[PDB]
Structure 1
Amino acid sequence: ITGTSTVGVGRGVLGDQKNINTTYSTYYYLQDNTRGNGIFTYDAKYRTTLPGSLWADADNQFFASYDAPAVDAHYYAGVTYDYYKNVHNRLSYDGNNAAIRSSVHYSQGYNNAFWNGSQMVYGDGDGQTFIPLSGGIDVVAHELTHAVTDYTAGLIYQNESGAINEAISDIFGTLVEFYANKNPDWEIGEDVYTPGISGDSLRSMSDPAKYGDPDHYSKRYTGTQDNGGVHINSGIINKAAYLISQGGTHYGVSVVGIGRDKLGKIFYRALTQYLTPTSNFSQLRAAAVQSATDLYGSTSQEVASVKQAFDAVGVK
């Protein structure tokens, strides 16, 4: 909507107060004009018609329980925007400041969040398996990263390119979580998963096997469920990424860690310059090696560590 930029205040899903960029014109709307061509957050009102209505509030205060998922979808979209711009010089998900649109209160008891090809969509969870999923910065940045991938490598969402697509989203969702630097970890979804159980999450990058996901190519899933296991075999690549950043010895193979920033540069460059829609795991290894070669040189530790990491998960 046309209006003047303002700053509202509210509480997110986890009860934390944050300021949010809004737009005033009769109502205060969740429209942030300070980032690219705008960040816009919508109310799906428990139904499934999208995007629903641009979020309107009479007084620019967003402290009602119903407001919380919107506050966090809006704010963490901005954090994700900031990460890609400041860390990778990328302006929004298309690299040309496309508007970022999000809808919350999608459906009823909906235990998921997703990028639909055009926007982000967040369920509220059923209160048991999940609380509103925009409360998880890694979930928000994971699904916004699917938009980045769709505009760059274009990894097809099935089989190994699909598991790479998923891992790329887990990798950058986690790096955005470290960027925001609030209780960061290498798990996925922990802030919004199972409020009745502490210490768990949807997936783990540092030990995928904690949830029955493979941590080596010899344990890959080859059936047809889950689009050929894209949320399962993503564990193989998540482990590789974790090892590249943090190092460790995995099934006897030692990896020298090079840290998060370099993991992020290498995988960003792979995603945007070398991966293609049909890339498989072995092709990702090559892309990552070449990216590390470009950035740090063929004889670098960075290249050697990337190779160690893919050897450790059985990917040649």
Structure 2
Amino acid sequence: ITGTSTVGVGRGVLGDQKNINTTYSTYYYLQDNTRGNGIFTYDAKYRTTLPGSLWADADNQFFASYDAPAVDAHYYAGVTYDYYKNVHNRLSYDGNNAAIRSSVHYSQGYNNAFWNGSQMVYGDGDGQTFIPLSGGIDVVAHELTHAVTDYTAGLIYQNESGAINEAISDIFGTLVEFYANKNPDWEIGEDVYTPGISGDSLRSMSDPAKYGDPDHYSKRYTGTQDNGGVHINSGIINKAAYLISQGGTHYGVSVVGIGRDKLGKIFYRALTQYLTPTSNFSQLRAAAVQSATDLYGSTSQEVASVKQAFDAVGVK
């Protein structure tokens, strides 16, 4: 809506205090006018009609328990916006400062979050398996990144292309987490998963097999569940991504790590310039190798490390 830009303050899902950009027009709305064509956060009010109502607040103070998921969806959308702009020179998910809209309090006890083709959706979790999923910055950036992929490579959400789609989202989800530099790791969802259990997460990039996900192609899932295993076989690519950045020996293959930033540049370039809707794992290897060549030279350590990594996960 039309109004004046101001700055609110509140607490997120983890009890942390943060400022948020809002818009005043009788009420203070969760509308951030400082990023592109705006960031907009809505209340689905425990129902599943979307997007719901633009979040309105009377005093610009968001310290109510009900406010927390909105605070974080709004804030971490902004962090994710900042990451794509400052690091990859990318203006929102479509590259042309599309408005980023989020809805929270989706359904009742909804243990998930997603991008629905046009916006972000966040459940509150049932309080046992999950707390409000917008509490996880990797979760927020994971889903926003599906918006980026859909507008770029267009990787079809199934089988290998689908598993690449998922890995890409786990990759930048993680890089945005490190970018915010708050308890960063190579795990996914740990901030909001199983509040009653420490140390766990939905997935691990550094060791997929800790949750039963493959870390080698020869261990790939070929059934038809989970759209052919997109959240399973993603472990093979996540593992490769982890290796390129952090290095290691995996099934006897040594990888020289090149760090997060170079991982980020190679996979972004791959994502936006070489991958296509039907790309398979072998094709991703080729795209990554070419991105690193483009970026660092065919004789670079970088290109070599990319090859090592895909080698280690059995992807030729």
Range into which the TM-score falls when normalised by the shorter chain: over 0.9
Shift of 1:193: 0.1
How far does the alpha carbon of each residue in 1:33-75 deviate from its partner, in whole angstroms, 9 at most, with x for none?
A: 0000000000000000000000000000000000000000000
Q: Using the alignment, how far apart are the partners of 1:270 and 1:9 within structure 2?
A: 38
SS at match of 1:269: helix
Structure 1 runs (4+) greater than 3 angstroms displaced: none
Q: Using the alignment, how far apart are the partners of 1:146 and 1:86 within structure 2?
A: 19
Q: How does 1:17-56 map to 2 (within 5 A)?
A: 17-56=17-56
How far does the alpha carbon of each residue in 1:245-265 deviate from its partner, in whole angstroms, 9 at most, with x for none?
A: 000000000000000000000
Q: Using the alignment, how far apart are the partners of 2:87 and 2:27 within structure 1?
A: 34
How far does the alpha carbon of each residue in 1:136-191 deviate from its partner, in whole angstroms, 9 at most, with x for none?
A: 00000000000000000000000000000000000000000000000000000000
Q: Using the alignment, how far apart are the partners of 2:129 and 2:207 within structure 1?
A: 21
How far does the alpha carbon of each residue in 1:75-109 deviate from its partner, in whole angstroms, 9 at most, with x for none?
A: 00000000000000000000000000000000000
Shift of 1:236: 0.1
- Structure 2 unpaired stretches of 5+: none
The corresponding residue for 1:140 is 140
Q: How does 1:181-192 map to 2 (within 5 A)?
A: 181-192=181-192
How far does the alpha carbon of each residue in 1:93-141 deviate from its partner, in whole angstroms, 9 at most, with x for none?
A: 0000000000000000000000000000000000000000000000000
SS at match of 1:243: helix
SS at match of 1:162: helix
Query: How many residues matched?
Result: 316
The corresponding residue for 1:167 is 167
Same amino acid, percent of matched pairs: 100
Shift of 1:205: 0.1
Q: Using the alignment, how far apart are the partners of 1:300 and 1:137 within structure 2?
A: 33
Q: Using the alignment, how far apart are the partners of 2:209 and 2:11 within structure 1?
A: 35
Shift of 1:244: 0.1
Shift of 1:295: 0.1
Q: Using the alignment, how far apart are the partners of 2:203 and 2:105 within structure 1?
A: 24
SS at match of 1:9: strand
Q: Using the alignment, how far apart are the partners of 1:220 and 1:69 within structure 2?
A: 36
- Structure 1 unpaired stretches of 5+: none
Q: How does 1:59-208 map to 2 (within 5 A)?
A: 59-208=59-208
Q: Using the alignment, how far apart are the partners of 2:196 and 2:48 within structure 1?
A: 27
SS at match of 1:197: coil
SS at match of 1:59: coil
- Compute the RMSD of aligned alpha carbons: 0.1
Q: Using the alignment, how far apart are the partners of 1:44 and 1:200 within structure 2?
A: 29
Q: Using the alignment, how far apart are the partners of 2:78 and 2:263 within structure 1?
A: 22
Query: What TM-score does the superposition give when structure 1 sets the normalisation length?
Result: 1.00
How far does the alpha carbon of each residue in 1:20-44 deviate from its partner, in whole angstroms, 9 at most, with x for none?
A: 0000000000000000000000000
SS at match of 2:47: coil
SS at match of 2:41: strand
